[PDB]
């Protein structure tokens, strides 16, 4: 209506369409990509695979905890 | 038009007790079918003997005494 154009909301409001949403969309991907890098690096470090894979799996490129917990008798 | 004191909480062809009777009949259908299933006694009509596993019914592999 006439007054909903004077209300500020994080989501954007009804029928929101900024003039530069293309540029903002590209930035948002790059920001999501930058914050996803440490999450991926963190995941590859704290992950444990007790069983060796049947066939070469892509996770052996970065993950290094393959067949490490086989000596479970000395776990903490 | 003064508001009612309980003005905070406000199937027309049936009443609460009549619909409760209908629900009781509907659930009694399930109860009667269960009683019929009991009366059938399918346990005594099994066509095969109970399965028997080796190594004393897999006692060791199921956590039994070694």
């Amino acid at each position: 209506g006439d007054f909903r154009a004077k209300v500020w909301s994080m989501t954007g409001g009804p029928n929101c369409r900024p003039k530069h949403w293309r540029r903002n969309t590209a930035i948002a991907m790059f920001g999501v990509f930058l914050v996803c890098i440490p999450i991926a690096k963190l995941s590859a470090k704290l992950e444990q695979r007790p069983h060796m894979p049947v066939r070469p799996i892509p996770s052996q490129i970065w993950c290094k905890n393959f067949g490490t917990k086989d000596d479970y008798e000395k776990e903490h | 038009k003064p508001l009612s004191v309980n003005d905070e909480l406000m199937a027309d062809t049936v009443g609460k007790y009549e619909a409760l009777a209908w629900l009781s009949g509907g659930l009694g259908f399930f109860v009667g079918l269960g009683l019929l299933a009991v009366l059938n006694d399918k346990a005594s009509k099994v066509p095969f003997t109970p399965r028997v596993y080796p190594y004393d019914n897999l006692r060791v592999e199921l956590g039994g005494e070694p």
């Binding site: 909903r4 209300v7 500020w8 909301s9 994080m10 989501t11 | 905070e8």
Partner: protein, 487 residues
């Protein structure tokens, strides 16, 4: 070296400085009061840092003679139980000061002075290790709160509510004072560490425990005496309700934790079913009465009785899950409930009404408020990822281990708690607008956005990683679990 002396003297200096400042200088009064509150909060945060979490001995102990023969004296000390209470009671004061920022021109200097005297009195309550002086500062809070309720009340009802609250507090206080006197005469002193090493005859445990329960149960309203809380709470300023619910409701439970659960281990066991019975029906009755309330501040005020009665189930379970998990609930309640009264205070300051009927459709005109209000609605209804769920679940696992039935009855509290919490939000926020009643709106300003920020951060930080708070208490709450036990 940060000790308990400076933390208590900071509000004293803050209140004295404003005492001799002309009232025409309204800006200077607000700045000095806010600065004093913030300095006190930082002092408390520093006191957290240097807190040892491996000894059950009281830390940062300070002594000041009171009687000429050192029979009773000012013994100040904190442990893993009362540290977070001190931090919370120093953190809530700057928020209360910031609440009345715009309208402060009418209140004057007597507002900040009253709140600073309040902070002075509540800091010493959680730090006293003397039974008598704990009572002296226990009942010194009445005068500032009496003044706050009466002078700056909303309607003419302020005279009745203040009288009722004062009378109830007095009747509890003197019946406790008689027990304190009997303990002093028999034992000889009133030091807590000495009273925890003195054997009490079994006949005297029941009488003293009942007398202590009389004063504490009023400030943790169990069942017969939760009729002063709604009236005195509704007839209070926006910042006044934050103090009453944030801290003043934590005296009863803290009093139980400090002076009841340990000084009488045998009496506590005998009265455990009694506390379970009162708390179970209080959770059921209060969470049900909340559905049929029409006042915005009278619904949240009934959301505290159910939550605070869930705490007393945890304390009397006498295990690490129970006692340890009950502390997190009060810290969570001190933040969730006090944040809800800020949300109601936001609505009341703009539109001078509290009936839920007048409110509706605010999601389309006040979206930031709706987002913030919804978040604290989720916290009030024990959602995981919030500080309330951690305390709520830890109490349940602490009581199921002792009695499966009481944990079952208390589990229906979250059934009813999630009922009115969302149903209130649907009425107030969601729905269609009513331009006939109210038509002018304004979303949260800079103060309201900033004020809610520490509540938002401090509610998920405790809700996703409560290990920071828990590991600081296990050494202190485990020594509390067993006192008379030696095996």
């Amino acid at each position: 070296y940060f000790n308990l002396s400076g933390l208590i003297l900071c509000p004293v200096l803050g209140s004295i400085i404003l005492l001799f400042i002309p009232n025409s200088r309204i800006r200077l009064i607000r700045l000095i009061g806010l600065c004093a509150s913030l300095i006190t909060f930082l002092y408390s945060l520093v006191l957290w840092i240097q807190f040892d979490s491996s000894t059950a001995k009281f830390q940062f102990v300070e002594s000041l003679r009171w009687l000429p023969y050192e029979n009773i004296n000012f013994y100040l000390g904190i442990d893993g139980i009362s540290l977070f209470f001190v931090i919370l009671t120093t953190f809530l004061i700057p928020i209360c000061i910031l609440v009345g920022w715009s309208g402060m021109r009418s209140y004057g200097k007597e507002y900040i002075i009253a709140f600073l005297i309040c902070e002075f009195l509540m800091i010493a309550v959680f730090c006293m290790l003397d039974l008598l002086l704990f009572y002296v500062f226990f009942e010194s809070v009445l005068i500032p709160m009496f003044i706050i309720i009466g002078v700056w009340g909303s309607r003419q009802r302020k005279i009745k509510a203040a009288y009722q609250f004062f009378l109830y507090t007095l009747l509890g206080s003197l019946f406790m004072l008689l027990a304190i006197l009997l303990i002093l005469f028999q034992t000889g002193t009133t030091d807590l560490q000495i009273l925890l090493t003195t054997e009490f005859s079994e006949r005297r445990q029941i009488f003293l425990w009942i007398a202590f329960f009389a004063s504490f149960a009023v400030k943790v309203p169990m069942v017969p005496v939760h009729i002063w809380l709604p009236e005195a709470h509704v007839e209070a300023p926006t910042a006044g309700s934050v103090i009453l619910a944030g801290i003043l409701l934590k005296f009863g439970t803290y009093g139980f934790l400090r002076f009841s659960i340990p000084m009488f281990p045998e009496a506590t066991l005998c009265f455990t079913p009694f506390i379970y019975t009162l708390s179970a029906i209080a959770i059921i009755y209060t969470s049900l009465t909340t559905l049929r309330q029409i006042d915005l501040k009278k619904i949240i005020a009934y959301s505290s009785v159910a939550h605070m009665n869930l705490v007393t189930i945890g304390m009397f379970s006498l295990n690490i899950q129970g006692i340890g998990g009950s502390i997190l609930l009060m810290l969570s309640h001190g933040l969730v409930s006090s944040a809800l009264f800020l949300c109601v205070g936001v609505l009341y300051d703009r539109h001078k009404t509290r009936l839920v009927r007048y409110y509706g459709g605010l999601v389309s005109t006040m979206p930031n408020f709706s987002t913030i209000f919804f978040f604290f609605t989720l916290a009030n209804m024990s959602l995981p990822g919030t500080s309330s769920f951690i305390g709520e679940f830890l109490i349940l696992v602490g009581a199921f281990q002792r009695n499966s039935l009481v944990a079952t009855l208390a589990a229906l509290g979250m059934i009813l708690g999630a009922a009115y919490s969302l149903w209130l939000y649907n009425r107030v926020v969601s729905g269609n607008l009513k331009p006939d009643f109210l038509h002018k709106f304004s979303d949260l300003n800079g103060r309201e956005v900033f004020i809610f920020i520490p509540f938002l951060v401090g509610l998920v930080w405790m809700g996703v990683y409560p290990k920071v708070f828990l590991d600081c208490m296990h050494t202190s709450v485990s020594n509390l679990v067993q006192h008379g036990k030696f095996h």
